[PDB]
Curated annotation (Swiss-Prot), chains A, B:
This is Minichromosome maintenance protein MCM. Inhibited by the cdc6-2 protein. The ATPase activity is not stimulated in the presence of DNA molecules. Belongs to the MCM family. The keyword Zinc does not apply. It comes from Saccharolobus solfataricus (strain ATCC 35092 / DSM 1617 / JCM 11322 / P2) (Sulfolobus solfataricus). GO terms for cellular component: MCM complex. InterPro entries: AAA+_ATPase (IPR003593), MCM (IPR031327), MCM_C (IPR048908), MCM_dom (IPR001208), MCM_lid (IPR041562), MCM_N (IPR027925), MCM_OB (IPR033762), NA-bd_OB-fold (IPR012340). Residues 276-480 form the MCM domain. It comes from the Archaea. Changing residue 351 to E: Loss of helicase and reduction of ATPase activity. The lineage of its organism: Archaea, Thermoproteota, Thermoprotei, Sulfolobales, Sulfolobaceae. Signal peptide: none annotated.
DNA sequence: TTTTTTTTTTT
């Protein structure tokens, strides 16, 4: 019952952070600068500053937030009166609630309490409007009266029309007045439980969440998020009894976090090592022995090149990798690692996917009867990585649907009266087997690969993996048994901080091509084209795409070391890795 | 008539277990310590203690369960006052009801009586909430009053709204108040009668059951369960009568069991015998003469290896077996035995299965038009065994759908806007015929098997069965006729005991590899690779998967004797069985 | 009719 508004104000005005800069007065300082009407407060900080204040938020959230938010509004007005007439209400979002519940473990005892759920966002609806205070007109020739229907109370989830006119006490018909009605932004989304916590032999569960006001459009499908709010039962058709007094539950979101400064200097410290590139390569799939050239190639695809956008066209900046190898060469294990270390990645298989599922699907809503688009795997992976294992098992009639997405990075649909064009700027990493399961060295490369030259030309690097039992079997066997015994390689960058390093590099580093790098690349391309003319039977063609592959690889090498430009050393590395690619496919220079 | 609360409390505190250790007193504090709020009792023990109490439970169940619930709750409160304010109600569940009725024999006379049904779980719905006590507000400008609608009575299965406001006696509008409403967990499941119970020439029948409160998520689809509770008629759509006074029936589950200390002593006693391994093998398919190497291989697949989960990857722990043989070699009979003895197994046929049915199917829900996922055979067999008879009859373009699930143990779907990943950690045992029905010795091994090298490398062991008539025909004929004469082989572990032994071993034994075993395995693997490279024509490739097969087989041998370590003896057995596999496919060693 | 994934008969 003690007044916490004074406690809140002194907590906000007077607080010391780890950096010792009064973290919580700069947030409100920027609150009036951009007028974002939302403040983020950590539960750990409020608990340390005042244990009693933190508890009251947890258990009395229903009737402490409006008072707490109202106190903050007055303080903001005192700081700057100009905030008036621009923002009427300010929301306070609390994160870091210790009450974390698994999606499958929610029971009746958790209804009405502030909890946190970690999951995957799978579906988002367009932003709509919700009525919380309506205005009605009594259509009865004596009344012609206006009144806000829900008195001293907001409109509930179910819309209700007055039965007795409050202005005259008589029944009749009432007409809604949209211009005098108060609205609020409304959005609906679906959260799916992570695959880690799904029990054996069961399908993942889903929960419906509601985003309102400034929380709308705060995430995109496929994101991993943490949501905090209050559970409640869902009402859809209360008018129709139809027996079955059984209801589903939904969650009213109060705050959302999508999965800091101490990371910046940690990343900067790593980039200062002259051997940072070797450390990153050694950290790719530590459980796999050998395959150093493949690990280097996979590292390049994670960083990628620099896309170019011009007045009349744009140039692809992503790097595509294709691996062909004998069974048991750990191709799938490395692809699994890539899907985990990448900040955004989608893992698909050749057999378990279709053309519609990879790019876009036209689906007809049975209710309304109209068609609309559904995002495919490549569209969802925009700005990230797409992994397509067992690509050779795809039907050729179905695999050609990704030809334009691989180069033009767009998806074109002309179906059922829908003409659309969606961005699909995603890198593609694929693996497969030769025509006869294992590579036959007694036959040409033409019949071993069994892939059209059109798709082969789209891959920046192609590596043919041969399982040759030689003298390295003992070393390989010892390494595998050590892995099974729990022994782990040391002096490697762990997956968590490696993910942060890639995300930072892809966002703030844009290397530039220097004059000396241009000469090395130009000379190499001329020799590459000249050497290819010797053997025209090979299904590998040296097209101008290969020249742009060298440019992209050179930029990726510079991006690994966080350099701002491409020097001759990065160009030399790009030529070296390209040489190994050519040797594998049988082109020797 | 009389109150048995004193008897019930006395029975709980005075009953004697098998060792007269009061097998019921230590359950009470376990209930208190973990706040499980659910206690189970055995009907045989209650009948053995007091005959009168057992009859009252078996007959007056609906008017004695709340009475015993209140008495037990009071005994808990005095034992520990902290139990209050955390659990407001404790349920007591009775099992072992003598009233057992087949699913097909239920008649109107059994309605309203405590019965028990044994069947197979097929469908389970997500957990929902059911209102048992509502709160309404009369929306009439004079009332604004809140009240609990169902007075001194639980809310019926049909949601009924008050017609006359009790607080004012007038009709009008009533608004539900979710905050003051009381809810209870609610789940719906479907049970099917056992295949051995279905009459000739008819489809199996199904029954709908309801699980509430702590009984939710008590089992997974495909389980064998025994459900006890009260039958009742189902009221689903009472809005419009439409004549049809006919109703279905459903069951309110009171206690559910799936599929112990005395068994543990029996299991541990068996493991003391030095020849337990040979004794177990002799118990595999006792009606089949010969095929000793096959029975040993099948025994290993039942136990499996030790899966390894690391911070960056996971390693398969299951063992896959492939059998190719001439018709009439008892391949199907042995596979049928594995289904009966395995704690969890799924039996499929190559011709009677599809790619979508094996892994996962995307289906359009008719009510809403939205696509959703359906679990396939491999997903339903997670943590168990999947049997695929007549694998050679599958279309090759359709058989490749299980390549991912057999090594990575995952199912990936990218179809119709759905991207998902599912766990399929199951062991695969497959059988089939050679290319020409019977094995042809003139032709090589490559054209006889007629399978791609990719699928062959996935199998830990491959055995080729040749039906060669010889001097052993008389022994085989005598054995078969003895089986038809009713004579049974003795000194074999019964199937029920063997199933318990395997389930215990797979849950509590995790063997570890010693230094001595590592040296033996490494030497043998190197020897395979050298020998394989000498004859680069066989359809069997010695990939690194073969090395991991040796580790998995060695762990299975140790797990078969409940050993915590993999000594050198288990390594020799693993090497020996692998030698026979190589000789079968014509690879000499 | 229309696009989609599925099992099925029949174009
Ligand atoms: Mg693979
Ligand atoms: Mg058969
Ligand atoms: Zn009026
Ligand atoms: Zn009233």
């Amino acid at each position: 019952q003690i007044d916490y508004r004074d406690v809140f104000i002194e907590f906000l005005t007077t607080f010391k952070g780890n950096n010792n800069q009064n973290k919580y007065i700069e947030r409100i300082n920027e609150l009036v600068a951009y007028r974002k009407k939302s403040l983020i407060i950590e539960f750990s900080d409020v608990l340390s500053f005042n244990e009693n204040l933190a508890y009251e938020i947890i258990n009395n959230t229903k009737i402490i937030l409006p008072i707490l938010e109202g106190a903050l509004y007055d303080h903001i007005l005192q700081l700057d009166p100009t905030y008036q007439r621009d923002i009427e209400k300010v929301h306070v979002r609390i994160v870091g609630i210790p009450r974390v519940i698994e999606l499958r473990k929610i029971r009746s005892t958790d209804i009405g309490k502030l909890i946190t759920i970690d999951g995957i966002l799978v579906k988002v609806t367009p932003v709509k409007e919700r009525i919380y205070k309506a205005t009605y007109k009594h259509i009865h020739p004596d009344c012609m009266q206006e009144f806000e229907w829900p008195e001293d109370e907001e409109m509930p989830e179910v819309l209700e029309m007055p039965t007795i006119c409050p202005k005259c006490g008589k029944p009749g018909q009432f007409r809604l007045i949209p211009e005098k009605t108060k609205l609020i932004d409304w959005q609906k989304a679906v959260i799916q439980e992570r695959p880690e916590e799904v029990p054996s032999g069961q399908l993942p569960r889903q929960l419906e969440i509601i985003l309102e006001d400034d929380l709308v459009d705060s995430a995109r499908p496929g994101d991993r998020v943490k949501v905090t709010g209050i559970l409640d039962i869902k009402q859809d058709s209360p008018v129709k009894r139809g027996s079955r007094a059984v209801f589903d539950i939904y969650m009213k979101v109060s705050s959302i976090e999508v999965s800091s400064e101490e990371d910046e200097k940690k990343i900067k410290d790593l980039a200062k090592d002259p051997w940072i590139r070797d450390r990153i390569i050694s950290s790719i799939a530590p459980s796999i022995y050998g395959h150093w050239e493949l690990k280097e190639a996979l590292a390049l695809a994670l960083f990628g090149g620099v896309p170019k956008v011009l007045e009349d066209t744009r140039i692809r900046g992503d790097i595509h990798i294709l691996i062909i190898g004998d069974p048991g060469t750990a191709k799938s294990q490395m692809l699994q690692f890539i899907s985990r270390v990448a900040p955004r990645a989608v893992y698909t298989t050749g057999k378990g996917s279709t053309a519609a599922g990879l790019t876009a699907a036209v689906v007809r809503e049975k209710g309304t009867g109209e068609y609309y688009l559904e995002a495919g795997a490549l569209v969802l992976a925009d700005g990230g990585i797409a992994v397509i294992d067992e690509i050779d098992k795809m039907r050729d009639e179905d695999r050609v649907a990704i030809h334009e997405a691989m180069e033009q990075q767009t998806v074109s649909i002309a179906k059922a009266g829908i003409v659309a064009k969606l961005n699909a700027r995603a890198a593609v990493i694929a693996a497969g087997n030769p025509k006869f399961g294992r590579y036959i060295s007694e036959r040409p490369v033409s019949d071993n690969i069994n892939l059209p030259p059109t798709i082969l030309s789209r891959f920046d690097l192609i590596f043919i993996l041969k399982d040759q039992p030689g003298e390295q079997d003992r070393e390989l066997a010892n390494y595998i048994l050590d892995v099974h015994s729990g022994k782990s390689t040391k002096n490697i960058i762990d997956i968590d901080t490696l993910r942060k390093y890639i995300a930072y590099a892809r966002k703030y580093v844009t290397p530039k091509i220097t004059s000396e790098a241009k000469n090395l690349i130009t000379d190499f391309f001329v020799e590459m084209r000249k050497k290819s003319s010797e053997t025209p039977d090979s299904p590998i063609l040296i097209t101008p795409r290969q020249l742009e592959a060298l440019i992209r690889i050179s930029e990726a090498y510079a991006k690994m070391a966080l350099k701002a430009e491409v020097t001759r050393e990065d160009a030399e590395r790009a030529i070296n890795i390209m040489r190994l690619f050519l040797e594998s496919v049988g082109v020797d220079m």
